Amino acid sequence: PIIPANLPEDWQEALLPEFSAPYFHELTDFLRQERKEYTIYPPAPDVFNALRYTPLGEVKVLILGQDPYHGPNQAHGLSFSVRPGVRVPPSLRNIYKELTEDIPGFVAPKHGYLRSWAEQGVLLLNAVLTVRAGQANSHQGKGWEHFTDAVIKAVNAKEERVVFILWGSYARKKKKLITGKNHVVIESGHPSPLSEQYFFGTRPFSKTNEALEKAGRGPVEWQLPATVTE
């Protein structure tokens, strides 16, 4: 139980202090109990999928969301992404509009599934990793934020350049944690339709690849497969 199931070895090094800490045991007890009274998203085996697909040593970019999508079949343990065959949410649709204008030759897919960004170093981290069906922010301040702050600080600890993409007011509160000399913070309003005029024209995807390239790192290939792949 103490260390979750199929986790890369660098995240074990990094996050053992978190996994064995009191606040984390109380959080998992909370979740055990929440899951017998409510449907909680994502499923238990997916909660840490961001860390599975993107080992600490392969992190190039960190794209922070708030909490998981809270409807059926959406959330699968990654920020912003949804499962194949599920309608692309409003924020992801705008992400795609901006990608088509920012990355010459990017072709928007019909799906919302972003595992291919994860499998190439994009850490798709929500600040809060679980939720009650129907209820946004229902697991806010139960312990996930101590945990995901510690994911964030471990990524900040890396010598090699990481681009931290902070979209919207919640995310931008983490700017203070990014102190590493080689890191880059790309900030703007959130892709959400409520705030989209502060997101369009910001070119976060090209600035990211430009920053990586300056530090001798490889760019992200933002193109998604046309069909997926679960």
Percent of residues in helices comes to 25-40%
From the structure provided, what is the oligomeric state, counting identical versus distinct chains? monomer
CATH homologous superfamily title: Uracil-DNA glycosylase-like domain
Task: Return Rg in Å.
Answer: 17 Å
- Give me the side-by-side strand order of the main sheet: 3-2-5-6
CATH topology title: Uracil-DNA Glycosylase, subunit E
Order of helices and strands: HHEHEHHEEHEHEH
CATH class: Alpha Beta
- Gross morphology: globular
InterPro entries: UDG_fam1, Ura-DNA_Glyclase_AS, Uracil-DNA_glycosylase-like, Uracil-DNA_glycosylase-like_sf
Enzyme class: hydrolase
Keywords: Cytoplasm, DNA damage, DNA repair, Hydrolase
GO biological process, one term: base-excision repair, AP site formation via deaminated base removal
Topology:
Blueprint: H1 9-19, H2 22-37, E1 40-41, H3 49-53, E2 61-65, H4 90-102, H5 115-118, E3 122-126, E4 131-132, H6 144-156, E5 163-167, H7 168-172, E6 184-188, H8 204-214
Helix pairs in contact: 1-6
PDB class: hydrolase
Keywords: base excision repair, radiation resistance, DNA damage, DNA repair, glycosidase, hydrolase
Assembly: monomeric
Pick out its properties.
230 residues; alpha/beta; Uracil-DNA Glycosylase, subunit E; four-stranded parallel beta sheet; two-stranded antiparallel ribbon; globular; cytoplasm; UDG_fam1
Structure commentary:
The protein has 230 residues and is of the alpha/beta class. The protein has one domain: Uracil-DNA glycosylase-like domain (Uracil-DNA Glycosylase, subunit E). The chain is 34% helix and 10% strand. It has helices at residues 9-19, 22-37, 49-53, 90-102, 115-118, 144-156, 168-172, 204-214, and strands at residues 40-41, 61-65, 122-126, 131-132, 163-167, 184-188. The strands form two sheets. The protein has a four-stranded parallel beta sheet with strand order 3-2-5-6, with helices on both faces. A two-stranded antiparallel ribbon has the order 1-4. The two termini are 26 Å apart. It comes from Deinococcus radiodurans (strain ATCC 13939 / DSM 20539 / JCM 16871 / CCUG 27074 / LMG 4051 / NBRC 15346 / NCIMB 9279 / VKM B-1422 / R1). This is Uracil-DNA glycosylase. Its main location: cytoplasm.
